[PDB]
């Protein structure tokens, strides 16, 4: 949800997203997410699943 004035100001100046990081950091973060889900998944499968 955005307000009309903010969107109009964004479109008038022709802004674009920009970044300074590399691609490896984001894929490392995604791998961290997957690892933290898999840890709990196997803990449940080895302790609670019944």
């Amino acid at each position: 949800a955005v307000e009309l004035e903010q969107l109009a100001a964004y479109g008038l100046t022709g802004a674009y997203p920009r970044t300074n990081h590399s691609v490896d950091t984001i894929v490392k973060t995604v791998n961290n997410i997957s690892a933290t889900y898999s840890t709990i998944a196997q803990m449940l499968s080895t302790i609670d699943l019944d």
Binding site: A35, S38, T39, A41, Q42, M43, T46, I47
Partner: protein, 50 residues
Amino acid sequence: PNDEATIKALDNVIKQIEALSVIVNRSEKADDAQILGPNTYKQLLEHLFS
């Protein structure tokens, strides 16, 4: 998955289950009876004539 979290979870679960299965219930209450100490009768005043 990290194999150092499952071991910790298993340790916690085992320790908790074992701490739950040691506590015992035992009471030492007395009975509602009494002591019934000794007593003697006492005579009321009387008047006698003939």
